[PDB]
Amino acid sequence: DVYAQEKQDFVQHFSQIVRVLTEEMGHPEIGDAIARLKEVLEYNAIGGKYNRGLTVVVAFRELVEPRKQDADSLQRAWTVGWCVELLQAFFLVADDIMDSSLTRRGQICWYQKPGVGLDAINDANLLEACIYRLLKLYCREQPYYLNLIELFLQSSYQTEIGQTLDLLTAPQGNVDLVRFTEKRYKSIVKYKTAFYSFYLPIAAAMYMAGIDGEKEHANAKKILLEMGEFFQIQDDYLDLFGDPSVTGKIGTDIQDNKCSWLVVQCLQRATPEQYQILKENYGQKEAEKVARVKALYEELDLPAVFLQYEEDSYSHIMALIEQYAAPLPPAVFLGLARKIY
Amino acid sequence: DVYAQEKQDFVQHFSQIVRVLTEEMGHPEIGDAIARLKEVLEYNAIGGKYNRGLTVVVAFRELVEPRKQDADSLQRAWTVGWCVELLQAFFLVADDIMDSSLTRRGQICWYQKPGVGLDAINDANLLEACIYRLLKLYCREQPYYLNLIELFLQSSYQTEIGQTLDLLTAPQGNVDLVRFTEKRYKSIVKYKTAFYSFYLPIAAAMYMAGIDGEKEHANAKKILLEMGEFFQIQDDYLDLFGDPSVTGKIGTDIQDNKCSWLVVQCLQRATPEQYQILKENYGQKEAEKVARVKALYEELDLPAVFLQYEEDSYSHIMALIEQYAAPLPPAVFLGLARKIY
Numbered sequence: 001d002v003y004a005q006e007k008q009d010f011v012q013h014f015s016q017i018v019r020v021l022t023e024e025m026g027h028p029e030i031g032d033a034i035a036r037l038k039e040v041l042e043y044n045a046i047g048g049k050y051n052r053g054l055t056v057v058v059a060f061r062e063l064v065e066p067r068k069q070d071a072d073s074l075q076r077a078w079t080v081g082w083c084v085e086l087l088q089a090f091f092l093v094a095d096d097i098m099d100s101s102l103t104r105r106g107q108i109c110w111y112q113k114p115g116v117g118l119d120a121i122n123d124a125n126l127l128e129a130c131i132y133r134l135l136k137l138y139c140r141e142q143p144y145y146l147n148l149i150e151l152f153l154q155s156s157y158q159t160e161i162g163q164t165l166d167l168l169t170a171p172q173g174n175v176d177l178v179r180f181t182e183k184r185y186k187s188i189v190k191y192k193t194a195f196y197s198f199y200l201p202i203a204a205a206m207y208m209a210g211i212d213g214e215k216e217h218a219n220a221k222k223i224l225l226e227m228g229e230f231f232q233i234q235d236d237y238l239d240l241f242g243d244p245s246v247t248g249k250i251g252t253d254i255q256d257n258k259c260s261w262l263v264v265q266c267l268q269r270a271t272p273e274q275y276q277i278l279k280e281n282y283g284q285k286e287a288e289k290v291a292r293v294k295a296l297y298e299e300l301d302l303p304a305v306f307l308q309y310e311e312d313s314y315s316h317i318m319a320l321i322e323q324y325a326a327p328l329p330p331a332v333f334l335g336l337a338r339k340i341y
Numbered sequence: 342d343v344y345a346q347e348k349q350d351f352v353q354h355f356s357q358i359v360r361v362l363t364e365e366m367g368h369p370e371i372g373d374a375i376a377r378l379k380e381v382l383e384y385n386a387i388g389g390k391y392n393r394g395l396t397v398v399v400a401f402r403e404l405v406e407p408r409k410q411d412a413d414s415l416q417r418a419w420t421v422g423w424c425v426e427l428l429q430a431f432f433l434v435a436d437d438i439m440d441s442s443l444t445r446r447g448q449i450c451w452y453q454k455p456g457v458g459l460d461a462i463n464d465a466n467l468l469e470a471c472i473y474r475l476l477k478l479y480c481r482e483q484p485y486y487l488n489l490i491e492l493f494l495q496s497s498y499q500t501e502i503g504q505t506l507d508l509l510t511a512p513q514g515n516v517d518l519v520r521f522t523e524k525r526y527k528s529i530v531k532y533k534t535a536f537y538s539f540y541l542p543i544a545a546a547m548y549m550a551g552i553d554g555e556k557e558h559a560n561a562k563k564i565l566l567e568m569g570e571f572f573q574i575q576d577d578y579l580d581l582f583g584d585p586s587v588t589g590k591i592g593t594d595i596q597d598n599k600c601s602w603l604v605v606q607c608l609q610r611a612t613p614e615q616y617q618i619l620k621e622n623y624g625q626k627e628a629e630k631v632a633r634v635k636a637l638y639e640e641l642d643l644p645a646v647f648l649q650y651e652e653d654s655y656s657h658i659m660a661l662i663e664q665y666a667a668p669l670p671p672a673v674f675l676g677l678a679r680k681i682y
């Protein structure tokens with residue numbers, strides 16, 4: 001991976017991110033808050049694979065004439081990559097509280113730690129605020145400063161809108177399948193995950209590289225939102241049919257009344273007898289009642305529909321790279337495609 | 342009031358704010374989210390006196406040569422005033438959840454409405470996001486655009502930091518009076534309320550007027566943070582000794598283990614017998630155990646200490662206006678002083 005090359009340099013820069021967000025050394029009065037902020041950063045922004053933030057860095061290598069990769073330019077790319085990870089950490093701390101999740105990456109969610117609770121709401125907002133403090137501290141003089149601020153702000157808004165739509169669509173506690181439509185599913189994915197996950201990191205790299213034209217961004221967006229769509233559809237598939245060792249942790253999507261790609265397809269493909277069997281069994285705790293939905297999906301050959309979808313989507317993404325990548329190097333999109341397929 | 346003059350024009354502009362944040366008319370997919378956003382705006386940003394947002398407008402009249410008050414400049418001042426109110430609504434929706442409050446302005450807190458609950462966390466973040474959407478929609482071309490974005494972002498961070506400090510200082514459930522010190526109290530007030538309440542609206546007016554020098558801002562800040570300090574100390578006093586009719590709703594500060602100005606003074610002024618009587622009775626539900634703290638304050642003549650403090654603070658604020666207002670018209674600060682004293 002072009003990712004395992006930049007990784008150590010990215011994780012090591014985190015120490016600097018933290019030092020600089022804590023050192024408010026002129027103001028001793030707020031010392032205790034700043035220590036809490038340190039703890040929030042370290043618990044919530046560390047632990048994952050850093051795919052989104054690393055993408056900022058990789059794409060920045062690929063886009064900027066290598067003679068303009070002076071030590072400070074890369075300082076800035078590492079920082080902006082960390083900004084994407086902090087935005088992510090803000091979303092997830094807050095989502096975990098809204099979902100009443102227990103763990104995140106097999107670790108206890110921050111709001112469930114003894115003594116944190118709902119104070120995590122302020123902590124989450126502090127994660128988000130750290131983004132603009134870093135952008136100012138590192139990128140204030142740069143011609144892309146305002147472009148980046150607007151990008152991060154816009155990425156928050158799109159994600160929050162998507163979250164609202166998700167929350168209206170699948171309220172934990174209300175089995176209503178009439179809400180689970182293909183259009184709604186696509187819409188949730190695009191706003192809630194694809195913009196920040198796929199558009200944001202590439203677009204940030206673009207602006208840092210001086211590539212600020214609206215059409216270029218619109219062109220990169222069209223490719224990258226499609227990738228985000230596929231990426232989430234594959235997550236929904238693996239959640240149930242992923243070999244749970246190769247994958248991670250067993251999936252709870254059906255139990256949670258999620259607007260999964262699977263239930264969406266199931267509903268489109270269903271005798272009126274089938275819809276009832278789903279109305280009855282979907283969103284339940286009972287293992288044998290989730291084993292029964294798994295069998296209704298298997299019986300509808302949705303794994304084959306998925307495999308069929310994964311191939312079609314792969315050709316489509318390549319047609320899109322062909323058509324919309326220029327004048328960015330196609331490898332910017334292709335590295336991403338390779339990681340997700 | 343120079344405030345009751347601009348008020349109707351400010352409240353009426355809210356309809357436009359809302360129309361423009363809802364009309365995402367090109368994107369029908371997100372219709373349901375946008376309707377939820379409308380409901381969140383209307384429930385949480387309407388209902389108070391609009392003192393902070395109005396200040397933006399009043400100060401903008403006083404600061405800009407009246408020949409530069411074309412209909413669009415005032416559109417923008419009304420919008421930026423509404424931005425300050427939305428920032429406030431973000432803080433309060435989120436604080437109410439963190440405090441487990443029941444009502445806000447005798448009305449049911451948004452997170453306690455049937456069907457909202459912890460989804461209010463996303464709603465709060467949407468309130469905050471609306472600020473930057475309005476700034477973009479109305480002020481994108483203006484030379485003060487970036488200055489305003491940074492001001493709002495900085496005001497969020499200061500407030501969030503203050504909130505952390507508050508939460509560490511007075512955890513509901515942990516009677517620890519060793520944390521309640523004058524320095525800590527002042528620090529909480531300055532970060533948590535004074536910056537957004539007093540500095541922010543004037544500073545926004547300043548930038549819109551073209552007054553962007555760092556020293557001018559530092560000068561206005563020094564006056565305005567002092568006013569914010571007094572304003573909060575007066576709130577803590579009225580909370581207990583306010584005639585509850587003239588004031589509003591009876592005060593629960595002692596019950597809630599708050600870092601009130603009153604307990605801070607009480608602790609400084611206390612035989613070691615007194616400290617025990619406070620250690621025992623502070624933070625309790627029982628009416629007769631809150632009636633007992635009220636009597637320990639009365640017995641220490643803290644109402645006289647307050648009256649003494651209010652006079653000293655009034656002279657100090659006037660000395661500060663004299664010294665630091667120039668070259669802004671002293672009336673910018675004096676209108677505020679008149680409203681709070």
Ligand SMILES: Cc1ccc(-c2cc3c(NC(P(=O)(O)O)P(=O)(O)O)ncnc3s2)cc1
Pocket residue numbers: 048049051052055197198201235248336339340
């Ligand atoms: C921009 C960008 C680039 C790559 C990714 C990928 C995430 C991911 C992935 N994610 C897994 P993880 O590696 O266990 O985090 P998940 O935790 O998101 O369910 N697992 C396997 N391959 C990939 S590729 C996500 C976003």
Ligand SMILES: Cc1ccc(-c2cc3c(NC(P(=O)(O)O)P(=O)(O)O)ncnc3s2)cc1
Pocket residue numbers: 389390392393396538539542576589677680681
């Ligand atoms: C910038 C600025 C300007 C004026 C104020 C004032 C708020 C306020 C006030 N606030 C009362 P309210 O009028 O009942 O909102 P509170 O709800 O804040 O406890 N009550 C009486 N006078 C004043 S002056 C606050 C901030």
